[model samples]
Target: MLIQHVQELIGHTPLMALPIEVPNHSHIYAKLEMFNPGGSIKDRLGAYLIEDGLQRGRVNAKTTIIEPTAGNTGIGLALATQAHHLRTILVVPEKFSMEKQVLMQALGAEIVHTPSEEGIKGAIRKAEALAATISNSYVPMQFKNPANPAAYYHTLAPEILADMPAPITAFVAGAGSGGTFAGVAAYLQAQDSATKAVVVEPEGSILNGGPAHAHRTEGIGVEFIPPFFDQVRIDQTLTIADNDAFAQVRHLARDHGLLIGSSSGAALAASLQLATNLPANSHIVTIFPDSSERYLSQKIYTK
Candidate 1:
């Protein structure tokens, strides 16, 4: 097999059927998005968002792309913008993984940190301010951009449908910008309304009507309810704690040799919860956005 550039290896990540026993008579399959070139599902968002901006004349060779991100999206944007030889800046919360921050800088992106107490909303404010002051800068705010949902609607959803069992009983995923949950849910529900879309959020996330605060889960907590959720049917939402999420990550790494992100852990925790209430032989699918390599400081598999 031959390949073009590294960026060409962005999508078509492998799907794995988990080799474990669920409490209920249900099975789980996970999309291994860590296989993407930039090491997470955000690679698709990076490429798609940047390409869309270019097509609409919102961005050009001289345009500097700025955005607020937790970690994965920043890495994705950094990798994608570097391909175009365009400058990129990411405003991130101080609480995320140190490895991810280094990865962003290594990709030639300037990193600005917001106070951890302010969370993602603080990063958003900073990004907006920077965009306003910098000449020819653009912020493709993932939270509100239609293109964010459109990317997964066209790409990830179809892949899940094709690779899963005859009927998908539930689609479980963590919500960040809410794009992945909304887009994938919309596509699945359109195919079969019986297919349930469950949004998995950390305890601090306000998605399930909770209070917003600092969370240990890096890539999947929401600062705001994403606009895309308005168009989809989310059957249920699961609020996972930092401990539970980290425990699941430890289990996957130790037992399955799958080093997944905390968001993936939260999704699995939600999937297990849903499995208990569903019919026998129910099929559920979830997404693992990235690997544990980026979360070393947290000692994801250890204490």
Candidate 2:
């Protein structure tokens, strides 16, 4: 066991093969990102983004970090802000997990809640409004910020390639800001064009040629096409329903002892579907972005 700074604890998460029996000789491996010190994959992005800002002289010790987030990023920002002795204020939609909001608060960030119906776009607007009023505040909008995607590209993507078997048949994950998908997919394709990159979305996400709406799966749905996707290749887009996502969430916990968030459940459900179309013994890697603890208020397991 090595003790490092909290920022250093972001990646190098364990990757475990899914224990469930599949139809073919296919095997599924999940990156246990919940093991991140902040308990979510966003920790990598948060720390890196803040550090990048500081390096460019864009963010300083006196600068207040403000961002529009759903949940995980807020916690990540809080973790980074507190470590650097900077103030942070997070603008989030009312619909995200209560556990995450509390976690952000616990990390010593000011929580600004936007209306649930208004969604993340609304939160962004609120974030900008607050930025105008606050003297030294900066909104590194995760949605359009290159740093958001770059964080995963530089850390998570490389770590996945390092941890997994060579020639990965497919790379699968859900999209929130689309940063994870964009960053990871680009890296995987650069390694092997034959490796398929599948992006999973909730039923309401517009990515799969559907109308945008409120989705039950928190932390991974998108109202608009993420800018990061412009530079990435998407082999397939799977839209998993809330019920199916929740079912897989329960399944992973019961069978694999992996307590994943709903977005990860959706990714796993999509990966399973992709597995059916893959060659025998194909290796498919997916990410479990967060733990189940954040969704307790949503009755994630009650159904």
Candidate 3:
């Protein structure tokens, strides 16, 4: 498969049925989005945001794209903006994966750090502040932007639906900006209402009414409910602890040879947790948004 442009490699990631056991012998399939050109699912969002913005006149020639991100989005934007010959500035929380930061910089996007204690909200504020001072800048504002969700609705969800031979019993995924969850779940539910929409979060996430705090999992938790949640039905929210999430990260690496990131760990564990409620021979699908390679600096596979 020789691809001329990087954008050509964005979607249609492989959907592999997990080789692990499940409750009632149900099948669990995961979309391996790590295979994308940007090495994560956010590549779709970055390209979509830019292309959608261009089509709507929200972005044009030489517009600087400013976005507050948790690493992968920065990398995705780096790839997307580079392809479009646009400048991008990324405001990131200081605590995300070091490898991701290096990759972001290597992708030619300028980086600014917000105190990790303040988390993504601080980054959002920083990005907004930067946008105020920059001329011809466009902040995708992925957290609140409808395009973020619509990206997956138009691209990723359809790929999953096409890949699966059986109807999905549950669409389990980790929510960061909640776009992936809202978009994919809404699409799956729209196609087949029987498919359960399960949103997975880490221990410190506020989804399960827990107090927000920093978590080891990088991409899945939310300090506040994303605006997209109001647009979709979330039937269940599973909160996986750092230990459980990391354990799956390690287990998948050693046993299954799937080097997934911590958020993917949370998603995998959440999928297994949801399996208990599903009927025999049912299909549960999840998203492994990125790989662990970008998190090797954190000793991601360490117990």
Candidates 1 and 3, the one with greater TM-score: 3
lDDT of 1 by residue, 114-199 (tens): 99878678999999999999989999898899999888889999998888867898899988888888888999899999998889
- TM-score of every candidate relative to the true structure: 0.95, 0.96, 0.97
Give stretches of model 1 more than 4 Å off.
none
Q: Candidate 2 residues 1-303, lDDT tens each?
A: 686777777799998888887646898888889999899998888888888788878888899899998888999889988889988999999857788888899999998889988877899999999999988877878888888888888888888888786569999999888888888888888888988988889978888889877778877887778889987778889999988888999988887688889888898888888889989899999999999987777788877
Q: Is candidate 2 or candidate 3 better by TM-score?
A: 3
The most accurate candidate by lDDT is: 3
Candidate 3 C-alpha lDDT tens digits along 1-303: 887998898899999989898899999999999999889999999998888889889788879999998778898878989999898899998966678888899999999999988877899999999999987999998888899999999889999989998999889999988999999988999998888999999888788999877788988788778889876778899989899889999999999889899999999899988888878888999999999998888888876
Ranked candidates (lDDT, high to low) = 3, 1, 2
Stronger candidate by lDDT (1 vs 3)? 3
- Tell me each candidate's RMSD, in Å, in order: 1.6, 1.4, 1.2
Clashes per prediction?
A: 0, 0, 0
